[PDB]
Amino acid sequence: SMSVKKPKRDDSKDLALCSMILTEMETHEDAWPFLLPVNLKLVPGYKKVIKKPMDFSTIREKLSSGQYPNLETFALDVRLVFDNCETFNEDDSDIGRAGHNMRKYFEKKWTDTFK
């Protein structure tokens, strides 16, 4: 509360560490469905169904341009990428399986880097 603060967690490396995690996600062999925005002209249904599209390139641009206020807003956009994927793709599809693999990969790196 006013003039009463928990001890200050060092967040000065968060930008660099989120960038490294994002690089590792970008270079994973199952990243290919997620590298670029889904083409809304060419994929029927996507525009209407997925209210907030997100992809790695879009996260990378937001990161590079100071559009994440903190590391939690960054994790929310990464998770959004996988949540959208599950909303639109069957579990038993190449893309569906890619999304589950990448989420697992991300969550481990997140825990190991920050928890």
Please name the residues in contact with 80: beta carbons below 8 A apart, sequence gap of 6 or more.
52, 54
CA dist., res. 80 & res. 3, Å (int): 36
Number of domains in the chain: 1
Technique used to solve these coordinates: X-ray
The values of phi and psi at residue 5, to 5°, are -125, 135
Dihedral (C-alpha) 71, 72, 74, 79: value to the nearest 10 degrees? Answer: 140
What are the distances in angstroms from CA 72 to CA 14, 69, 75, 79? Answer: 10, 8, 5, 10
Q: Which residues form the domain of 38?
A: 1-115
CATH assignment at residue 96: 1.20.920.10
